[PDB]
């Protein structure tokens, strides 16, 4: 029952999408969208932002065609409020806004939230404020509660309209700061599920595994998605066709994945190395 959001219509995140976007290969882009929907996607993340390129021009071109060719809703992945308003114009009732945050302060947070409210769009909110990204359990809860209060009391948004993104960081560099980061998000999600009944939770699941070989990313992403579902995850941004059921993951790979996610270091044992070692050997 997870709302799966296809991740691959993303210029920075997909070479295939980027090349087609740049060449205005509309039918290639629609073919990529349909593949994702057939592989399980109930919605599609759309991030066309690319440095030194015009986001609004790309969106003005693509969005009208997405409105007629797709049935599934679009999650508009942008930090530009004008980009969000284009999507809201061309896809009325078929938009999730990704995202609002508090890094720019309250007025900017309020401007994005007002769009969600005025247009009846679902709203993603990141655990990010004026001091930056929430990496610990404690920071995530603090930022989330501040946002929830504003979203409900001031904008009159319903818990059910909200998707809290408590942030997915790679646990693959192996430095002391990044090792616990997936565990910290999982724990914050369980706590906020109790504190904020009725709110959705979303994660960019693929970020947890950056740097590893593709077969290893597939396993780690799937295990992390599964763990998150148990903590209360309601939606996920994923490569729709590369989510394995837990039962298809070999027992040793599964156990090493959980060790890596929960940072189960001991004397002789580095889970990062052991997880990487498994995929060379098998
Ligand atoms: C940070 N992400 C994220 C978000 N939005 C929210 N709300 N939360 C998030 O965590 N939007 C973008 C990204 C999620 N999307 C993606 C998309 C692709 C890849 C990715 O790993 N791409 C591969 C593909 C390479 C290719 O085929 O070109 C890569 O290695 O970059 C990761 C995350
Ligand atoms: Cl502003
Ligand atoms: Na992007
Ligand atoms: Na402020
Ligand atoms: Na402002």
């Amino acid at each position: 029952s997870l709302f799966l959001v296809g991740e691959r219509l993303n210029a920075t995140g997909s070479k295939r999408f980027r090349e087609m976007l740049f060449a205005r290969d509309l039918e290639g882009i629609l073919a990529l969208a349909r593949e994702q929907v057939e592989e399980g996607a109930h919605a599609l993340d759309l991030s066309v932002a690319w440095t030194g390129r015009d986001e609004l021009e790309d969106l003005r071109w693509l969005l009208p065609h997405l409105a007629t060719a797709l049935t599934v809703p679009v999650m508009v992945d942008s930090t530009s409020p004008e980009a969000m308003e284009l999507a809201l114009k061309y896809l009325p009732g078929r938009v999730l806004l990704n995202s609002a945050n508090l890094e720019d302060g309250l007025e900017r947070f309020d401007r994005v939230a007002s769009l969600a409210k005025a247009h009846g769009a679902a709203l993603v909110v990141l655990a990010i404020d004026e001091k930056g990204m929430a990496k610990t359990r404690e920071e995530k809860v603090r930022v989330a509660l501040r946002m929830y209060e504003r979203l409900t009391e001031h904008h009159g948004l319903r818990p059910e309209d909200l998707l809290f993104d408590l942030l997915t960081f790679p646990i693959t560099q192996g430095d002391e700061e990044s090792r616990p980061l997936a565990k910290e998000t999982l724990l914050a999600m369980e706590e906020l599920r109790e504190r904020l009944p009725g709110v959705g939770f979303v994660l960019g699941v693929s970020n947890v595994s950056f740097g590893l070989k593709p077969r290893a990313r597939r396993v780690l992403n799937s295990v992390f998605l599964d763990e998150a579902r148990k903590r209360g995850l309601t939606a996920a941004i994923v490569d729709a066709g590369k989510i394995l059921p837990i039962s298809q993951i070999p027992e040793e790979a599964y156990a090493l994945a959980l060790d890596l996610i929960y940072d189960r270091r001991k004397e002789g044992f580095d889970p990062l190395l052991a997880f990487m070692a498994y995929f060379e050997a098998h």
Side-chain angles (χ1 to χ4, degrees):
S1 75
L2 291 166
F3 194 76
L4 296 178
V5 179
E7 84 187 3
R8 282 306 164 82
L9 300 186
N10 189 322
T12 49
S14 164
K15 192 187 199 197
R16 191 179 155 195
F17 172 69
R18 176 164 72 249
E19 288 174 345
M20 296 189 296
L21 181 60
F22 283 25
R24 297 266 175 281
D25 183 354
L26 177 58
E27 294 302 323
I29 289 168
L30 297 178
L32 177 52
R34 288 187 215 104
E35 277 173 32
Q36 280 182 99
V37 174
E38 285 157 12
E39 284 145 12
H42 299 112
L44 294 180
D45 197 54
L46 177 61
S47 157
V48 305
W50 185 263
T51 304
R53 196 184 166 83
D54 190 340
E55 175 171 24
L56 306 177
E57 195 195 323
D58 280 340
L59 289 176
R60 203 179 298 112
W61 173 72
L62 185 53
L63 289 168
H65 292 110
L66 297 178
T68 68
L70 306 177
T71 35
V72 301
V74 170
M75 179 163 71
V76 194
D77 190 336
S78 186
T79 64
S80 160
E82 289 292 338
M84 287 174 183
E85 277 156 303
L86 285 188
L88 290 163
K89 193 192 156 155
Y90 286 120
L91 296 155
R94 324 226 319 268
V95 181
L96 303 95
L97 297 177
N98 177 26
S99 53
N101 72 65
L102 279 166
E103 189 167 301
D104 296 354
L106 186 64
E107 284 187 46
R108 175 47 69 79
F109 181 83
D110 285 346
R111 181 186 179 173
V112 175
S114 286
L115 292 166
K117 179 55 176 189
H119 293 262
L123 178 57
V124 181
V125 284
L126 308 186
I128 309 183
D129 68 3
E130 298 90 337
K131 301 268 63 167
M133 293 188 164
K135 296 203 180 184
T136 71
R137 169 171 195 180
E138 289 76 21
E139 290 165 354
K140 293 170 199 292
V141 170
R142 269 154 178 162
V143 180
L145 294 180
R146 182 183 171 198
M147 288 173 159
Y148 177 85
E149 287 154 5
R150 188 65 178 177
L151 293 159
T152 57
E153 184 269 356
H154 188 261
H155 298 277
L157 287 159
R158 309 189 283 107
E160 293 79 20
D161 298 336
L162 307 181
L163 296 165
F164 288 78
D165 188 340
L166 306 177
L167 309 180
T168 308
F169 293 103
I171 62 177
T172 200
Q173 190 182 349
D175 62 294
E176 200 58 47
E177 195 191 2
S178 73
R179 279 177 187 272
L181 294 181
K183 179 182 81 201
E184 292 297 295
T185 285
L186 291 168
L187 293 174
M189 189 174 291
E190 186 172 306
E191 179 177 340
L192 288 166
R193 184 173 49 176
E194 285 175 40
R195 291 182 181 285
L196 303 182
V199 306
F201 292 93
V202 70
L203 283 172
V205 164
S206 299
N207 297 118
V208 77
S209 66
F210 261 114
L212 308 178
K213 292 154 55 177
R215 320 204 324 285
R217 295 192 68 195
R218 210 166 297 136
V219 166
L220 190 62
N221 295 337
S222 297
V223 179
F224 180 66
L225 181 57
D226 190 61
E227 290 304 301
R229 194 198 65 253
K230 299 189 217 140
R231 307 288 173 159
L233 187 77
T234 60
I237 302 160
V238 293
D239 189 356
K242 313 287 189 207
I243 296 302
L244 302 170
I246 296 311
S247 63
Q248 282 167 34
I249 300 172
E251 195 261 310
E252 192 185 358
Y254 182 62
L256 294 178
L258 290 177
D259 287 339
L260 182 48
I261 289 169
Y262 291 106
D263 181 27
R264 298 204 226 276
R265 274 175 294 171
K266 323 174 287 176
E267 284 179 45
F269 187 70
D270 189 324
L272 179 53
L273 286 178
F275 190 72
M276 292 165 64
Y278 176 88
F279 295 98
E280 290 287 302
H282 301 266

